[PDB]
């Protein structure tokens, strides 16, 4: 924006059964990883790498208000089809979404938060690599990408 303009690259994650876009760091905190280091550890792998470290900084600055797991679940539930009124109903809807809708293939059980976190971090990693320019953008016509 005209005022700050320093965090222009915000990493945001659309989710199944959740209307508005959700900043990715809130999703990672909702998985059960509230620590900022504990999230950037899943996203960025070689810490001495300055580029990714700076490039994830906007997504970090854009969520300081949501700092606890249940607060994160409240945020992601506030975009449900019908959040209801009770805190512990929005909480349960967000847990059900992050359990069954978001990334089913990594798992659906109640003990796969770490797997879902690692995989979403890998997606943000691939997005950051496409941003910097290391890996090339994937191709839709390439027949290996079709089944």
Partner 1 sequence: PILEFLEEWSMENLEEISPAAIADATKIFVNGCWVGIHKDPEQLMNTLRKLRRQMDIIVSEVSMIRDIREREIRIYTDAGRICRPLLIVEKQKLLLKKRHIDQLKEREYNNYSWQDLVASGVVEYIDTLEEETVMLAMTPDDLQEKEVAYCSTYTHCEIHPSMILGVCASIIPFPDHNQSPRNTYQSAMGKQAMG
Partner 2 sequence: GFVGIRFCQECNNMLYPKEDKENRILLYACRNCDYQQEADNSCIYVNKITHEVDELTQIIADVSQDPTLPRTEDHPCQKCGHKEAVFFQSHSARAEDAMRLYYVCTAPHCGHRWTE
Partner 3 sequence: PKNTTKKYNIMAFNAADKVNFATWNQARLERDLSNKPEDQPWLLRVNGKSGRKFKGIKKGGVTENTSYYIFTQCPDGAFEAFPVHNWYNFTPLARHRTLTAEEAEEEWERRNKVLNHFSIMQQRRLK
Is residue 135 near partner 1 by the rule CB under 8 A? yes
Is residue 50 near partner 2 by the rule CB under 8 A? yes
Across the chain, where does the E strand assignment appear? 12-15, 18-23
Here the tokens at position 72 are 């994160």
Q: Report the site for partner 1 in 77-116 (rule: CB under 8 A).
A: 105-106, 114-115
Interhelix angle 69-77/24-31, nearest 10 degrees = 120
Q: Which of 5, 109, 133, 141 binds partner 3 (CB under 8 A)?
A: 109
Q: Which of 4, 46, 82, 141 binds partner 1 (CB under 8 A)?
A: 46
Asked whether 55 and 132 are in contact (CB, 8 A), the reply is yes
Q: Which of 111, 133, 138, 143 binds partner 3 (CB under 8 A)?
A: 111
b/e burial code for range 114-130 (CB count within 10 A of at least 16 → b): eebbebbbeebbeebee
Is residue 42 near partner 1 by the rule CB under 8 A? yes
Question: Which C-beta is closer to partner 3: that of 29 or that of 128?
Answer: 29
């Amino acid at each position: 924006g005209a005022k700050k303009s320093a965090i222009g690259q915000r990493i945001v994650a659309t989710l199944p059964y959740i209307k508005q876009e959700v900043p990715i760091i809130i999703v990672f905190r909702a998985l059960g990883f509230v620590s900022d280091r504990d999230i950037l550890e899943h996203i960025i792998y070689d810490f001495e790498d300055p580029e990714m470290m700076e490039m994830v900084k906007p997504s970090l600055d854009e969520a300081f208000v949501i700092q606890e797991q249940n607060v994160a679940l409240n945020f992601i539930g506030s975009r449900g089809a019908k959040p209801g009124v009770t805190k512990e109903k929005r909480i349960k809807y967000a847990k059900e979404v992050l359990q069954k809708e978001m990334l089913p293939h990594v798992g659906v059980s109640d003990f796969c938060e770490t797997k879902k976190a690692y995989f979403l971090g890998y997606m943000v990693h691939r997005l950051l690599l496409a941003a910097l320019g290391r890996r090339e953008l994937d191709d839709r016509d390439h027949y290996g990408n079709k089944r």
